[PDB]
Structure 1
Amino acid sequence: GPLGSMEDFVRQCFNPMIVELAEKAMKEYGEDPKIETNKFAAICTHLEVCFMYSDFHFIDERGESIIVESGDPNALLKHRFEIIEGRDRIMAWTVVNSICNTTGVEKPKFLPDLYDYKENRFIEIGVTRREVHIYYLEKANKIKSEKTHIHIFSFTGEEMATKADYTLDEESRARIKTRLFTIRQEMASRSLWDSFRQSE
């Protein structure tokens, strides 16, 4: 069919909060969302994954990790994950430093994406249009002996995580994989997927 705009796709597919945080991040790093449109889409996707990973996961009044999908958590429930991504660098490092003071976890060399209050570890989220093992190994060769746990998602449903430790249940991860599949198929419908896949 016709070739669409990636700009139009991003503004229709992602919630306005995600699009706004992505625009803010690209301005911070000197990237124009109007030009680097495939990168804008990749930033929105990765943000959405980070939010989806955290969504519905709480620590309850007994210190137990649970799942509440109702939308209406009582105010004794703590989010299981701190979301680091989506914050300007100052606030992102302020949150990191605050977690490290609270938990005694080592301060990470590189800004991570999430912190898991159950597993007591930072998380690096990856989303790739390439083979997941290739992107896992690129992240691994960057993080080295840093204690940040790596979790990679592809658009084809493959995953790879540090030491085969996937953190979340299968249904939580399937929600993320279903969303990535939806994004890929809607990109393909608008003849965007080929440029997007090859720009990685």
Structure 2
Amino acid sequence: RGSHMEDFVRQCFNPMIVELAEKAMKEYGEDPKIETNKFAAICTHLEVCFMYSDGGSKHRFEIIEGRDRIMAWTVVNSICNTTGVEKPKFLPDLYDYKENRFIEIGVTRREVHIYYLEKANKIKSEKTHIHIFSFTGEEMATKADYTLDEESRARIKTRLFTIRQEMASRSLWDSFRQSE
């Protein structure tokens, strides 16, 4: 099928992220060789989730994203049945053992304003925290509480803009921006 996107994705993200993105995609009946924009996004969203969890303290976060659907919900339940938080309706990306809340991480090519309202209206889980980033460098978190310190968040932002430049250097960014 031979997509420039697909070769760029494989040279741009580390193999562990690429393998994991393929699982979720196939597990949801999507094709990384055909749905190449979504493939690029899932990797990106995956790497952000991973840097995010790296920002905290040793035992701070439980990583929900990157597991398979059944096991992701298994840990979700174990978390709810031991802390007592309400079981979310939709799969979150993380759990903060420090603040005792679930995190939903979104990565957008539009206004951080737009995505967040979209995610807040779908959630209505109240307790679940929302933290979104954009490819231009803005972030936006519930109650203005950004969980991590500035430097951990600054790096994520830097990485997201590197991915943008690399995508645009290959004339792929325009098509990627119109994907979301």
**1:21-59 C-alpha deviation (Å, 9 max, x unpaired):** 100000011100000000000000000000010xxxxxx
**1:67-103 C-alpha deviation (Å, 9 max, x unpaired):** xxxxxxxxxxx43111101111110001101111222
Name whichever of 182-191 and 103-112 sits farther off.
103-112
Contact 2:88 2:125 in 1 (8 A): no
Distance in 2 of aligned mates of 1:79 and 1:41: 29
Distance in 1 of aligned mates of 2:122 and 2:59: 28
Distance in 2 of aligned mates of 1:116 and 1:137: 22
Contact 2:103 2:129 in 1 (8 A): yes
Contact 1:115 1:122 in 2 (8 A): yes
TM-score by length of 1: 0.84
Q: Any gaps of 5 or more consecutive residues in structure 1? A: 54-77
Residue correspondence of structure 1 range 52-131 to structure 2 within 5 A = 52-53=51-52, 78-131=58-111
Contact 1:108 1:146 in 2 (8 A): no
**1:137-157 C-alpha deviation (Å, 9 max, x unpaired):** 100111124311000100000
Contact 1:83 1:115 in 2 (8 A): yes
Distance in 2 of aligned mates of 1:19 and 1:146: 32
The corresponding residue for 2:6 is 7
| Deviation of the 1:104 alpha carbon | 1.7
Count of paired positions: 173
Contact 2:110 2:134 in 1 (8 A): yes
| Deviation of the 1:185 alpha carbon | 0.5
Contact 1:100 1:107 in 2 (8 A): yes
Distance in 2 of aligned mates of 1:33 and 1:50: 20
Contact 1:84 1:96 in 2 (8 A): yes
Runs of 4 or more above 3 Å deviation: none
Identity between Structure 1 and Structure 2 (%): 100
**1:178-200 C-alpha deviation (Å, 9 max, x unpaired):** 10010001001111000000111
Distance in 2 of aligned mates of 1:98 and 1:15: 30
Contact 1:80 1:118 in 2 (8 A): yes
The corresponding residue for 1:47 is 46
Contact 1:109 1:146 in 2 (8 A): no
- Structure with the largest fraction of helix: 2
3-state SS of paired residue (1:32): coil
| Deviation of the 1:11 alpha carbon | 0.4
| Deviation of the 1:129 alpha carbon | 0.5
Give the greater-gyration-radius structure (CA): 1
Distance in 1 of aligned mates of 2:170 and 2:161: 14
| Deviation of the 1:167 alpha carbon | 0.7
Structure 1 pair 121/136, CA: closer, same or farther in 2 (3 Å)? same
The corresponding residue for 1:170 is 150
3-state SS of paired residue (2:42): helix
3-state SS of paired residue (2:92): coil
Distance in 1 of aligned mates of 2:45 and 2:125: 24
